[model samples]
Target: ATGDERFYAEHLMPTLQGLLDPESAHRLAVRFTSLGLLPRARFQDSDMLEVRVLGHKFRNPVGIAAGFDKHGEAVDGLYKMGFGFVEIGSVTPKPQEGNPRPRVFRLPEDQAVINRYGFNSHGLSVVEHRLRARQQKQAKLTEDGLPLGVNLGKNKTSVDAAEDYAEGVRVLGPLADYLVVNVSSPNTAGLRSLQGKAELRRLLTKVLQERDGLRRVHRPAVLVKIAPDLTSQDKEDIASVVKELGIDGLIVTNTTVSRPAGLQGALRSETGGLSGKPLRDLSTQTIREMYALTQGRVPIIGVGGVSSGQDALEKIRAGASLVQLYTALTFWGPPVVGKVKRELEALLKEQGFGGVTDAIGADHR
Candidate 1:
């Protein structure tokens, strides 16, 4: 029985990589997950792993980041694998084909993926239809609590970026436990510019207005996903604006355009956002800085290189209230979720922490 998991970890991803391209493998995986064909590897989490943040309860702090289920195709399937939360989409208002093929490259040597997917999404309507179907069918939050989040991106050629984000908030906000205004994707032209202090304020203010207009019951927490590549001033500006505007949360940090010095991937020079092990330290540093800049007030969903329980714990101790991962899945398969949770629970106990919350910002203390 346990060998089934070992089989998945050892053979599944490598076999798929051998037989298919990265994007194709990603699609097949998403399709399988949507059809409930992946491993039903749900593990009961310990109470120590529960995280209550942003007005929702999470069975554990482990979550799959956006992009893996770009169209929300696998929400329930992901829950079945025991992810405490699932964030789908970088969904734009209109369907986008994104960049040319061969946009996704793997760096197995570096344990990384560099993708310029450019937010290829099925657009708002299709994703909305899918989520609504799940809601009507009562395929919603699990008994252990699984929060669903929507990561919103704007159309490639759209003149009004704010309007695109506002539309996403107005339409998808009601269906989500949280909504991500993702202005950090390095793939989209001019998208990262929105992260500038003044521009960020303008963009988020519009998003917040749209969110507030939703029926209060359905309005979801709004979080900003930011690039790891930021100047000290840029970080301060973000922390100040986030504090001033009261954004619901911050996902720190997004994939980076700056390649690390020792990145050993053949595709290391690929012009796109790089994620995975190469990103772990930079991501954690940003989290630490952001946590300090915000004075630990803003809830942060830490991401990047979270392939193990120790990695997740490092992020938590650095002040991440929750941790998410996607690239790790490419290497470890679905079993990684269970692996991270068990490791985290044990680490919490080993560290003399009574609960997960007690470890948040332990490094700072």
Candidate 2:
């Protein structure tokens, strides 16, 4: 809430989002940022917010989740907006149009979003081209550097979906700082089924094989993103897989199919995974449980209803090493990224914590 930032957020951005359907507004965001006209973050972060995870240094723990940059069109633009990391894509092996129109919906009453967009993507080759060009110009274009991650998914009609993830690793393994196997999105017909212990074991085996096959000097760290709708048994099974297989990290959640208790209004009936404020508790609980179940062995990226620094910190205090958000950006606009950082810096100092890592899982203690 300062100067032009306040004006744009309170007056302009909301009007913009309010005018366009959420999907169209999202498209405008991507299209506009791709023009490289957005404001870049010039503020320096305190050492307190810095963190090391998956063997890389992050300036801060805030990251943009997978869906927003599905085609990798705005990676540099988003990083410039001050996120510690920018993860692009839920890329499939081939291009897809996703589900029919009206698939994405906004629930302003709940500060939530519901989408059955499937895994609509620009495919591997196209996504690769964007990253290749970004990396080629990164040295010159990058100022304050950040890790870039890629999220991989299965094609809707693909017969051998497991191989699709393997293909993703083989293709982008050399380029990414990390690669995420996204099996938690409920939109795809049987995507979450891959989360089953047996199926997950099979998929991870192939992904690791592809990862080990890389010839690059720096191989990407590989992680898995899970759903929030898991039962205690299901969560335990996932924890067993993480410990047993030694996957790099786990994204604590994608979205939840089980709607929480307090959503009021017509849009509450919308189908698809629920995300936003209503998702805060369930996602945090999962992160808490995952932390305990894994004995905090696997680092977690909590991402489900995060909109503010406190919301983000709650996940960290619960067990997340890093956290991400999508729906909040819809309401808060780009300035929200830096705003959260500033607020986070103050909160840490006020709370008398030594640093970001020191505050992690403090709630569990």
Candidate 3:
């Protein structure tokens, strides 16, 4: 890492964390990146780290997960921070206040975060404005611009899940490189139930229908983000539905509700989705199972607790075609992005693989 980046991560970030609440600190971080105040990454990417998926070339497989930029305000900033792609939102159709205050807690001891943000979004209209402006500017940069994904969520009081997702597709589909229907957030009361067989089929059908109606020449790819707390049947059902509907991809997990044993933090019992170190194994296991169930046909974006190059390599070997992380950023800051890519590039070569695609599903092979 560069000298200034190291100092900000080690000294300035810790000071900020000590002084502000988790949510507030998170806001300031986003603001810094969105304003281009943070230094851009200083290294060149090796061709070996490039991943061609969803009909686009990801300069690298490392990306910032959705929660970090919920409103699409930090795309340029995050792109500067060296994320191969930036996913913004678990945004709802209407603006929301989400859960009450004190809803986000840090488990520093566990390197984890527990949040009940409940799709706290600035709504689609606001997010669309930002992305629209970005789209215009990105046109000039063209191939140099990073891929962007918009993750859609349902409003808490909304009765029709399919309608909400369809609306998200109608409005934001053209502006996104890809879109994710996030039905797995633990904070939303009945959101997880959308993953059930009949419900998933109904929901995705409408979303895809809306996407197909888009006037754009090339429609954005639609993917589903699911929770990690699935039973064997739930997994099987999800696999069948994705196959039946010809879905573009699957984000292996959203944050999980089940807290594993040996969590030592005082806030361990807090009610919310838990993400970070404790989620590492569960997310990987889910990825492996999902890959097998899909017969290696569907691309999986592996997420949950990825912190090091070794951690990312494990996910790729298990079955993930790409990897993303959010909670690790809570502990480490932007430097973690470069650290992961550099380490992954070395590991991929040393393991006798020429590139990321060669390492994918190595375990199953």
Candidate 4:
């Protein structure tokens, strides 16, 4: 089906407060889709939505964020819903149970979610197996549009976080269209510290070195995902790192740890990373700052609270080569991507831009 039938998913994914707990509900959705609780697919690719970044052509500029498909499950299912790309697995090097129970808290009143899940994963070996199988059956299970990406993370108890990143790049990099070095997640203690100037420089150096070594067999573009709660100086340091390293891309602004003053949700106090509507401004600011910092040299994938096409376009104008969403799915449901892409297509023409790429960083000047 094309984009207009967005209501097709109305009965499929449902709301934030599902029959089970938030995290379990998410798992259930992924499991069901793995078998096909899954709706089939939609938002047939259009030339208007195509975007070229990271040395490939995207069916659209919207993609799935990392946290949603935590274990690489349901990559095709999400792609069916009209996402130009599906990003899966903030997977760890080893299997992990993550944090304690009730790790995922939904703040519907604030249209946000707070999760302290410390990178619970099925390990790279398992993920690699699944991805290989999926790749083998590409003609059957794959979505025809954008490329698939993997978000690589470290175990909760990892002593050498940098090595794990390089390891993720070496092992999982072959099957993925692109790979993300996720050092900004707040749940892992001291994980954010890896984003520090010297530390990040050292970390990317190792990972990029590993990537270059594998350039012959498979050269997946490497990207860095950063947190939204960074200082100006911190952003500067990161910009320099990406610029110097020649990284493929940057996912600007991951979930935030800072709490705003007027959060009305009962779960507002849950200690963890916050995502969704509350994060729009902070994430966008980082995009704008990073765009200016890099002088539009590197591509930026903007995400955070993007529930509508307007939000998507806001990110584009601010210099996002592409945009992604997860939290708002609970509010707008699965068809949201179709609606967003459709709206954004019209907005692009209205703004007198030739294509989505033309709008990137248009708001900065």
Off by over 4 Å in 3: 2-10, 139-142, 216-218
Task: Give one digit per residue, the lDDT tens place, for model 4 in 115-168.
Answer: 998889999999988888778554232234468888999987889998888788
Worst 10 residues of 4 by lDDT: 136-145
In model 1, the runs with Cα more than 4 Å from the true position are 1-5, 136-144
Please write out the lDDT profile of model 2 over residues 9-102, one tens digit for every residue.
6798779977898789889988877776767766677899988889788889999999998999988788778888888889999999999888
Candidate 4, superposed: residue stretches over 4 Å from native: 1-18, 37-42, 136-145, 215-217
lDDT for every model? 0.90, 0.84, 0.88, 0.83
Which ten contiguous residues of candidate 2 have the minimum total lDDT?
Answer: 136-145
Report RMSD (Å) for each prediction in the order shown.
1.4, 1.7, 1.4, 2.5
TM-score of each: 0.97, 0.96, 0.97, 0.93
Clashes of each: 0, 0, 0, 2
lDDT, candidate 4, at 84: 83
Clashing pairs in 3: none
**TM-score, predicted candidate 2 vs. hidden true structure:** 0.96
Ranking by lDDT: 1, 3, 2, 4
TM-score of 4: 0.93
